[PDB]
Each structure stands twice: as structure tokens, then as C-alpha cells.
Amino acid sequence: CGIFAYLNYHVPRTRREILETLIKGLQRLEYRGYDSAGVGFDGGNDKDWEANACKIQLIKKKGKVKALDEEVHKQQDMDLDIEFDVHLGIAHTRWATHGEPSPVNSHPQRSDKNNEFIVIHNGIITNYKDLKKFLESKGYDFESETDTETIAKLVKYMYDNRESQDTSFTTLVERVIQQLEGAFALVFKSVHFPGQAVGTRRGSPLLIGVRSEHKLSTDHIPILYRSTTCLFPVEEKAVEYYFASDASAVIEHTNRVIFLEDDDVAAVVDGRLSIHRIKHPGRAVQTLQMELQQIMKGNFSSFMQKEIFEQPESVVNTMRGRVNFDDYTVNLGGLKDHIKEIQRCRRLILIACGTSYHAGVATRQVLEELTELPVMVELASDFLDRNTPVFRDDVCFFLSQSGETADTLMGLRYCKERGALTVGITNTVGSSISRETDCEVHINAGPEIGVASTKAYTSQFVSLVMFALMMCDDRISMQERRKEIMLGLKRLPDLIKEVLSMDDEIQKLATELYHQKSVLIMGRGYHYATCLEGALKIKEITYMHSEGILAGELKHGPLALVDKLMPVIMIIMRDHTYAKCQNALQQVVARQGRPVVICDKEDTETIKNTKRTIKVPHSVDCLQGILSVIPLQLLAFHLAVLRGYDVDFPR
Amino acid sequence: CGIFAYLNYHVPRTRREILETLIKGLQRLEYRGYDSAGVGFDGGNDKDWEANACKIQLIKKKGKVKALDEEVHKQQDMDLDIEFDVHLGIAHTRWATHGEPSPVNSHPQRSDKNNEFIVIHNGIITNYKDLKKFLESKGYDFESETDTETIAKLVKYMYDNRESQDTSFTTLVERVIQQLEGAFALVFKSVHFPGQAVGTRRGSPLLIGVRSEHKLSTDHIPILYRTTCLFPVEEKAVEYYFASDASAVIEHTNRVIFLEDDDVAAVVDGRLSIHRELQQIMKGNFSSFMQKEIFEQPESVVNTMRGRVNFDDYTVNLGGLKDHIKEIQRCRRLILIACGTSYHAGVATRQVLEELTELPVMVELASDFLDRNTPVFRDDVCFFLSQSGETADTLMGLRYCKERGALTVGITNTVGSSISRETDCEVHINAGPEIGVASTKAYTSQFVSLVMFALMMCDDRISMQERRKEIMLGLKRLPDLIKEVLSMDDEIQKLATELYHQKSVLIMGRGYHYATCLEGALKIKEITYMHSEGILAGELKHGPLALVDKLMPVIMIIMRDHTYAKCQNALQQVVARQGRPVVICDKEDTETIKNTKRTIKVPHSVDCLQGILSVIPLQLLAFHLAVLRGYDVDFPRNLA
């Protein structure tokens, strides 16, 4: 599920430097999870580089990139010092789908025993059964039980049955994808097209990074259907191309990338990058604000720990350039060309999955208060099962850190067909949801490498609060309320630091629950979402049965679980539901429940009457959710560590 | 909470027949509160009834009503052989949501150590904090920490400062209620006013039953302001029954008078003035009410459709809506507000409501609906699902929506309930009294009722005629299919013996069966006390699935509808995690049955009705798990 190819055109690189670059790339893709990896590069030890462009070498292995890196440098009859003026190396980390992990099932997949064509693939070819039967009937021997091998054997079939002896590499791949069905991200290499690469995608991300000390011919690559029309360095030839399924494998070399779209066929021929279609439109060369530092653990022992403790910083990034604390105004540039239409709509629909859905639940109330519109928060999978009524005056938000979640994306396309105005709240540039929405409000929390959503939840939280502030910027009666909320956002990053400084108090609680199998997290109002999110975090990370219960529903059944044995965590803040939360607390205690209470620092009443209490600082009622969810993020983290679990391991 | 009093006027009863009538009344009301109980009756041991009304007796004991019935028939200082020609006895069972269920906090609450004024109360006083300081400054002590003792200590303050030496008992009560805030339903007794009973209400049920072999004076008692009262014409033989519910009175008589807010009933000299079927409540042959009500669903479902669904011509007529259905159709959004199982009923019918009405359908938990101050508009139709018609949050949501001009519809199982009265129109689900503590037949009747409403909202759409026929045919066949599900009772019990020792179980479903897995998880929480949780199958891949291993029990629902393939994927994910789940599926689903060891095979019905059949196995499962764990399915812990 990880792609990375490095094409150095007239930028001399030794075989070692090339291989180190490929390994270095896959290391940026490990966090996605994998079971095997491999590389493809020109073999041969001829001192001259061009004479070796007819001998493709493969080194694949079931295991981790480290073991692959060892297998690379641990080779004989492979001189690592040969200098290549032009070379294309491809690398891939595999997530086994068809065929058990193994060296032969690993990528790159080859077209024959001489490696005339090789390909790396992310996705699934649904119709690989029919295609395999055909190529077998035409005389092609398959060695692996993967769907990918179909792609390698097929491009050779097009090459073997080509009309002219000089048909373009692009043409062959075009004829390949036309027969493929499903989702894929592909990178091809062939001895018959030395130094050339061809990338194409359908339902799977694929981008191309570029670097050159010389001026490039354009920043908008025009499309070519079946010169001035392709990207290249102007006065010289030196250039470096980086194909990748994830920007994290590219950002250390360059931040100029091109995001391919479905059925695009990008080709590098003679060092010049062109983009071909079948069927003026074009693909932009854009600058990413991402930095290598943002995807490194740093001094933290895990990504989960880093992304939790850097939340004072990611909250600020989410507000940067949008909230003016000098005159207390909000401006989301992403909506400038749609805000006037959004304010004439009659309903907000928030559609997401998992923790992204919790972000909607966490901001529904304030959205209702400031927009005065109906606000429906839907789970994308259910939203689709029911064929929910959607109308042309609906504003449908789509919350997705990745921007690729299937159900959320399908919900987007469902709402577009019904004429609704779609808004994306993503954390991934170039993602499907950011592209297909009419407009977006990028979360701007930096990449999330951890398996669970920590800083993404809080940055989504803030993003919707800011939108809510935009929707009432013209209402006199709400000026004070907006000022209150914005002072809270001004003070929020320092309050997050204050909560993180209670990490010791959370560890003592993780020790209290170390042996427990269940825990009930109770809350209501602004902290309903805190229950659901904390309970999901503890489920996902700790593997214990944590459940979020709406405090107002205890009397209707769930209160029967409370006794002297069941652990309970209650959230009680100083908002308008304080009196009702005290009642729930009295119901729990009356049934021999001894709960842990997450309450306000100055809530002296509950602190003296409750043994263990996490005392978070006070914020505005519609922002407390961020501060009260953090102790639950840490609790899940510390419980997992206590139990010997790897928090960064995606179980 | 429950209220019951027995006032026999010129009907000689012994002290045992009265005490056995107070306990017999609390047993009829025990399902509203079984944390503590008490009885208030005249003490003393004289050779008549004209010298025992100066010293009242209180027997209050912790626990259910059974713990009180024994504290009465054991005291070595009480002769249960005295004859009373006139007597008044008040009883009460309490739901101690706060503090301890101790005897002192139990009712009746007294006004002093000599039991001058005793009172029974149902509700909350939203200002006892201020009244407690006003009473403590005049020389009154306080023995308990309940908001109900303030009612006894205050009625005495109005008696120690009365103007004339002949002020009526009603006058003393009218001055009290004027100083009380909130809701309350009171029934007073004293020594100063022997045999006199005063009953008032304000936001709480309170009726008065009347039995007498003599013709009563009138059938419409007139209200009085500060041929007038109800009494037997010929002689003076009459029996009154103050009660907070009609179940404690049907056993003796069916002639009641439903009081109203601020009414102040008063029985003076056996004269009642106002100021300003038994089989349905019997277990029959079942060991518990819950089991009866589950096996009764074939009948309750029919009763819900009776006189409303014509299968010969495929007609659906809900008489309760005949004066609003045309205005309901011009509306532009549906909102379902309820709590707990009633909320699940909305989740279980949301999809079909969206399908047949083509309107937005929003389902809200009343408690959260209020916390957020949800936007509501004049063209909204707000449904309030409430078996009892008295749930506080659902009722407050009703008054909230009314203030904003929405059209309100009640879906209740109780005639005369608050929600029934305050809504513009109602649809009584007519499922019969639900005595079990968990809602079983009420859920499936609310289910059917909303489906019938959906069928009305599309009766003029040509494109939906066939879809309507499909559903109504399913409703015709539903009672027999419910019976088929109940024939698997023994098969469900065996699976329960495999899970009763487990601490958790995940119930997974999607689409029409999201509600099923939510309702099932609640039932297993409520009566078995296992940590059961409902998980939307489509959400497994987003975190919760990490909780599944070969040890975590899992129940899945895989029915034959448009989500079958997706449900198969969720099942394949569970297995990959070494899960060994119990799958509720269709009988013809041979694929699922072959590849899954444990399967509960329910018959196929219409996709929008399958939820009724898929929840019943989970109802029965909760029952058996509770029995296996040694619990009483009736009277679970920590609530009522």
C-alpha cells in the first residue's frame, strides 16, 4: 500500500545512492502498515551506465524494510559504485490482499523471467480472474497468486501485440487500464523504455514530486488527449522525479508535487513529464507546506505521544491566518467564494466516520446556537443505508482526516447528485474529499502519523467552531458571545499545556484501571462527544471495553451497570448542565459507584466529595470538550503502555 | 414512586383487612418504586373506633414491599383484631434515586414525634431548601433529608397559626401548596381531622376510586372556589381509594375521578368535594411479567393494528390523526423525541419514515434535545414516543416544541397521561399495561404504530402503492412470525448458558437493525447487568473492531435486505479477529448458517418489519441470562 519511485535524469547517482533513496522512501511509508517490500533497479556491473538499462534487477522479501535494506547491501556480484546518469528505481511496501506474504507475492511483479516489465500496485484488481484466464490462454505463465501479476503480464501482452515497433509506453499502459477493473495506483518500468516511467491511478492516490536547480517549463501541466505541453527544465536536462502514493515519501526531497487524477497516465520520456488522457484542463504543480520534521517522532517515544502533546501547537496552526485576535474577527479563505450561498441555506448536515463523526457531535450545539439552523450529524455508513433525504438548500460537511474514507466519500457523491452544497473538512491535500467538494476548510493540523486520531479531532473541533463564528459575524445580539468564544480560542493553547502538565495524575489513574476490563464514561451536553471519543480511544488503543453513556439516559436502563465493581469516569464542567450532571453523579454514588470525575479546577464541591478527580482548567462552555477529552487520550495511551502494547502498531 | 390509601367509611374492617389492603395496593404500584415502603394507619387498642384516631402508627422498612409486609405482621405491640367502622390509611413505595433507601427517609413523612400531620408525596419540591430554613427558625426539627418532610413540617405551621379555631383541612392544604414549587401529588392524614383525607396534585398523577352498593349522588362533581359532593344517597356506606395509578384500583372498582392540576380533593364525612380489565395486570401462568409481555407480543401487535388496518383493501386509518393528517402532510420535517427504548423505536422506523414520507426525519434523545436547545419551527411535526406518557425529559421536550409553534403528536400507551393531553393529537398504541420493568411489547407496538403512520403519509402516491401492499401483507403475517420466533425460546436459553458467565458482549447490526442491536444491548444491560454494547457494523473498521478477539462474546444480525453483503463483510472482519459470534439471520440464509456454528434462525419478513423479529431473540436472551445469573427479571437494581 506504499509506492515510491525515484527517477534521476542527468543527475548522476551511484547504485548505492539510488538504493538508499528507495529504502529511505519506504521508511516514510511503513506507518501505513505492511508485511513485505521490494525494489526494482537496473542490474549489471558494466562501468558505463547505459549498457545496463536492459537488465532489470529485483530484490523482494517478506518482512520489514530493515530486513530489505540488509538484503540490499548484503549482495554479491552487484557493484554499488556504478554511476547512473539516468535511472528509474521503484519501491513498494505491500499489504497482503491476494496471496500470503512471501518473496514471490511481494512487489514489484514482473512480466516474465527476464523482467521486461515490472509494476508496483496499490489496490485490488476486481476482475483479475477473467484477465488471468485470458493471458493464460495466450501463453503466459503466472508464478504468484496475486492480482498484481495480471497487470505485469498484461502490459507485455499489449507490447507483444503492438502495431508499430515504436508505440509509446503510455499507449501500452492506456490499453492495460482499459481492461482493468477496481482500484489501483501503478508505476511501470521496462527494459524496452529505459529511463522512462509511467504512473496511473484509479481510486487510489498517486503524486509526482519534482526537483531541479533549473527553471521548469511550467507550473500547469496541460492534458494530452488521443513542446509547450509538458514539464521539463528549460535550458538544461538535469531533473529529479519522485512518484509516490504519499507525500511523506517526497517532502524531504521537494515540496513541488503534482496530484494525478483518476485515469491520468503520467509519463516521463527523455526526462520530460507529460500527462495523457483518452477522452484547457491541466494539472498544477503546487507547493506543499509539509515538513519532514512533521512526520518524525522527535524526542517522543511514539507518534501517539507526540501528536497528543503537540496539540497546543496544532490548535494554533488550525487557527493561523483565520482568527484575528487583534480585532476579534474570523475569516476562512476556503469559503470566500461560497459564504454568501452557504448563509442562504436552510440546514447543515455533518457526515463522517468514527472520531471525525465525534467532532460533529462535539460542535453540533454551538453550530445550532450561532447558525440557528437545523444541524444533523450523521454516520456515513448509516447515512448511505437509509438513503437520507437531501435537498438543494442543504450544506453538507464531510469530516475526514485522510479525505479518502470510502463511506464519507460516497456520502459526498450522494449529496452532490442531489444538488446540495458540499464542504470538505480534511487534513490531507489532494485527497478525494478535498477535491470533489465545492469548497473546503483544511484542518491544517499537520500530518497525523499515529493510528488513532488525536490532534485531528481537536483541530476538526476548532475548525467547526470557527465556521460557526463566521455564520453569525453579522448578528448584533451575538457579538458578546463571539468575543467570549474567541478569547477562549486565544487562551486555549495555554490551557491545553495546563492539562498536559497533569500527565502524572493520568498515569495514577491508568494504574487504577490497569487490571480493569470495562469502564463507563458518562457525560452530557457539550461532553457527550467527550464520552464517545474517550470510549473509542480506550477501545482502539487499550483493547478494554470502554463505553460512552449519555448521562441523561442513565435512569432509563444503563444505570443498572453501576455498582462497587464497575469503573466509572464522569465529566462534570461548569456550564448550564452542571446541576444535571450533579444529579447523575448522585445517582451513580447512590448505587455504590465510586467514579472518577473530570471536573473544573475550581469546582470545590465535587473535589471534596469525590476521591479521585482530574481537575482541568476552565474555558468557555463550547470549548471545554477539547480540554476534557485530552485526559482520556492520555489515559488510553498510558494504559496501553502499562499493558506492553505498541501504540503505533495498527492492530 | 407509588401512592395508595384506603378510606373505609361506615364499612367495618379489621386492622388486618386494612393493612392487607395497603400492602395489596403497593404491590400493584411496586413496579414504579421498590427501594423502600411504608404505611400510615391509626394505632391504639380500644374497644371501638372512636378512641384510636388520636395516635397514628407508621411501619416503614427498607427494601421492596415484601420487606414491609413482614414488618407489619410481626410487631409484638399491635393487635390486628380491632374493628374500625371509619378509618384512613395511607401507604407509599419509594424510588430512592438519591441518598439511602433507609426507613427514616421512607414515607409517610411525619410533622413531629407524635405524628400529628403525616403525608405521602410523589415528585420533587423545587424550593425545599428555602422552606427548610423558614421552618427551622420557628422551632421545627428535621429527621430526614428528603424534600417530602418539608410538606409535613409546613402543613403544621399553617395549623399552629390558623386564624379561627374551626379552619377546615382543605384550608390548611391550600396554604401549603401556595408555598410549594415544582410538581407533587399529596395525600394527607392526621389526628386532628380523623377519617378526613385531602388529595391534591400538580404535575403528577392522582385519581380517586369509589365503590358503593348505593347509588352515588352525581357523576360530575362540581369544582368549588374559596348536591355538591360525591356520596351515597340512601345510606353512608362508601369506600374511597387514593392512588397514583389505576392498577391499584381496578381490582376493587372501575369508577375513578382523574383529578387535575391544582385540584384539592377532600373526603369529609365520606363526601368527596373538589376545590381550587383485571386480567391485564396479572402474570396469568407466567413466572414473571416480562416473560408474559414478551410472549404476549403476537396479541399486542394485533391490538395495536385493531380497527386501524384493513387487509382486504389495504387501508390504514389512525383515527387519532383524522383532524390533522392533512396539515401534517404540508409540514416539511419530522422530529422523533423520546428516551431509552422509546428512542430506539424511532431509530427502528426512521428509515421507512424517510422512505414513505420523503421528509427529513430527525431522531433525538430528549435529555440531549433539551440541553442543546435544538432549533424547532412551525412546519415541524414533532412525535413524542412515551409508553408512560409521563417521562420528564420527553414531556419537557413537548412543551419546548409547543412554545415554538410545532405540530405535536403523542405516541403513548397510557390514556390521560401528560403527553397524551398536551399534544395536538395522539395515537394510543393500545398494547395493554406494561408491568415489566423493561419495555418489551411497548417497543414493538411503538414500532408498528410508526409504520402505520408511514403508510398513511404515502397513501396518495401511485409509485408507492406496491410498496404499501408489501408492508401491509407483512403486518398481516407478522403475528404468526412472532410466534415462530417464540417457538425458539428453548434454543435461545441454551445459548444463554454459554454466555451468562461473561462480563461483556458486543451486539452488531446496521441499517434496519442498528436499533435492534441498540435495544438488545440496553435490555441485557438493564436486567442481566452484563456490559453489553450496541455497535453499528459499518463503524467496526474505524476503531471498535480492535476490541474483538477469541474471548470477547459477539452477537451479529445479518438479515436479507440491501445491506446483506455489507453485513457479510463485517462478519468476515469479526472472524479474522478470531471472533466466534452468534449470528441472528434468516432461515433461508444457508450460506450464513453453514459457516457459523451458533445461529438464531428467524423467519423472513419485509425489510422494514424485520427489526421486530430480530429484537425478540435478544429480549428472550436478556431474560434467560438474568435467570441464569440469579436475578429477578422483575425488579432490577438501581432504577424502576
Ligand SMILES: O=C[C@H](O)[C@@H](O)[C@H](O)[C@H](O)COP(=O)(O)O
Ligand atoms: O481513532 C480514530 C480513527 O482514526 C478512526 O476512527 C477515524 O476517525 C475514522 O476512520 C475516520 O477516518 P477519516 O477521519 O480519515 O475520514
Ligand SMILES: O=C[C@H](O)[C@@H](O)[C@H](O)[C@H](O)COP(=O)(O)O
Ligand atoms: O427498557 C428500558 C425502559 O423501558 C426505558 O428505556 C424506558 O423506555 C424509558 O424510561 C422511557 O420510556 P417511556 O417514556 O415510554 O416510559
Ligand SMILES: N[C@@H](CCC(=O)O)C(=O)O
Ligand atoms: N492486491 C495487491 C496489492 C495490495 C496493496 O499493497 O495495496 C496484493 O495483495 O499483492
